[model samples]
Target: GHWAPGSHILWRYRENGGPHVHIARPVTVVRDDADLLAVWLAPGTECVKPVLADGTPVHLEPLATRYTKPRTVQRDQWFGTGVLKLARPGEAWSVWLFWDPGWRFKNWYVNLERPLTRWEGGVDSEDHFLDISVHPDRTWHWRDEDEFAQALRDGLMDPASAGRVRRAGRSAVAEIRAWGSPFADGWEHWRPDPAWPVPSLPGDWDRTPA
Candidate 1:
């Protein structure tokens, strides 16, 4: 069994190689069933994201020290129009749909990571750092390859794991090349219910797994 549509839950990312959740986003269930786990990450939703220890932005750090530097997590807002995320169970990547203001549908983003681990509160996974950007016309490109390489250099991912991540990327790219389930699923036209309220970030957003 899975969460019902309209239920509120946390979609979180555990720190790479650690149990602590460094990223947490409260999302509303869109569709959760055998076919997929779809959720709405509404704009302005309070969330937690990783930052440098001195409160410096993670992206502000040089890539050479991005992962090697001391870091902390901070609460922030999810900017932009919003996102509709769809994940197939046991898949290494989840697809996210973005929209600009005025509901102009943007491209799809394939986030490569460990298959999610679902619990009572929500689901969790560690970011793989590599991703793909798929345009509406079906053209696709790899995103964050540099960061992926840097993560390995920083000892965030071992060679064996990096190999696996590359394999996952290949798998996702194959799907995109073939016009896959999510990209062909017409999710770009899907819109969130206007009445659905934005969920609040929980005080224990970083609580250890139960």
Candidate 2:
């Protein structure tokens, strides 16, 4: 069992080192199987994300206490363009495809994280802070290393655990270097079904694991 194409599901991320998910988005399933799970997050869809208790954007906080600062969840709308996320079962990262408003392709964002744990309502994982940005021309660069380091200093991830994430990141980089499967798969050439309505955010978007 896998979710069928066109199914609606939540793709959620738990608060770092915390028990509850702080981010959740309702998405339409594009493909789901042993090899890959792909979903679309259409723009303007309602979702849940974290913000500082002071109501400031999480990123705007100075790095010194970004991870340690008090925060809360906000029900918000998806910003900018829709994203197509592709992840292999048990992979440490998911590659997300972004686009500009007019369907112009942006870049692939490599979100480093723990492998997803599938549940009845959706799959869950924790954001690892560090990320990689791969450009359309095949050039790439690391992103948010500062936040990742800050997380470590703020006691979110210990040395050995962070080491493991770095190893996973290296593995993902090799996959990108080969430019195989997903990247070479011409997913950019694919488009969503015009008839597919945007998925709704279920009332229990933050339901306990099933």
Candidate 3:
């Protein structure tokens, strides 16, 4: 199905040797019928699991973490990207379209819903762009950048919280630019599963749109 210009969708990343997660928000396509969803992984939009003072799991909370976003993301570099299609009336199922960032083919499934709770750690604040095709009958649920910025301006989110997200985003860009180069080698031990889907454009599967 053809996607609308501004629609919300979910972007799930299956990291190498790690669990899968998603990003939730409404997004705008630069062009119609675009088949990819691109999102900027910067501050305010990134979070992490919480750790106790003893360095152990302490009831996961949102913490800021960095990600590598290359100037140009090659399909091979991506771990995976999942395109979502909302279910129709009387149908409780949703669709998940999968793309292997390292490969060319895309796959999909229906009725796959993973629980996504908020990360208790800090948020990434830098700007990241996620590009994807929109499916008919599926509307995005995230606010645009301007609206997000306005929320920050209006005190919807505190300054400290905002700063953490922003800083994480800058860190992510730096890491990507330096990936596999000198002075920065060795992967951070990423858990295979985080019990949370990467948050992107999530649709209201259980409710009717306004």
Candidate 4:
């Protein structure tokens, strides 16, 4: 079954076997059908995410201590103006579009993660930690290989799971090589309807179903 448009769902991430969540966001469903699951995250939505005590981005940390370093996901405002995130059911990665404050397109971000797991309130997945960035020119590069490898070393992903993630990444690379639908599909030109109200962050965004 598909979630109706305007439905609210939690987009969340946690360390494998970790006691608590490290990232959480309440997002509004844009399109939810057999082929795609699209959501919009408006600016100023209350989000929970990990940050260095000194305020450095996690990916900038050294690989050796990245996973072992202290971190916390307290309430914080979602950065950037907004994001349109899209995923194909069963795909290993989801692509997100970033925009400037004036709604000018920025670039596409490919986040590798476990395929989403649907629950009563929302969806859940673990970040694979690796990512890719696609420029308007269609050129791209790996974003966080070191962090990915470090996650493996930290036992966040077993060898078999790592292998699967790598395979999925190669598939994504192949799509990039061919300039596939999402990249070629003019999503960059997309603009949200002004009349659509920004979705609210429900107070129960942290609840996870059994």
TM-score of structure candidate 4: 0.89
RMSD of each: 0.9, 1.0, 20.7, 2.2
- lDDT score, candidate 4: 0.82
How well does model 1 score by local distance difference test?
Answer: 0.91
Tens-digit per-residue lDDT, 32-124, candidate 3:
232222222211222222233444432232222112111111111123343333222222222334434442334323321222211221111
The per-candidate count of clashes, in order, stands at 0, 0, 64, 0
On residues 1-210, what C-alpha lDDT tens digit does candidate 2 reach at each position? 899999999999999898887999999999999999999998889999999998789988889988888998999999888999999999999999988878888888999988988998888999998999988888788999988898889889999989988998898789789886677787776788888888887888888754
Q: Could you tell me the lDDT of residue 165 within candidate 1?
A: 95
Worst 10 residues of 2 by lDDT: 180-189
Error of 1 at 206 (Å): 1.6
Candidate 3 Cα errors over 4 Å, as ranges: 1-144, 180-210
Candidate of highest lDDT: 1
Task: For residue 128, give model 1's deviation from the true position in Å.
Answer: 0.4
Error of 2 at 81 (Å): 0.9
Q: Estimate each model's TM-score.
A: 0.97, 0.97, 0.24, 0.89
User: Between 2 and 4, whose lDDT is larger?
Assistant: 2
lDDT of each: 0.91, 0.89, 0.29, 0.82
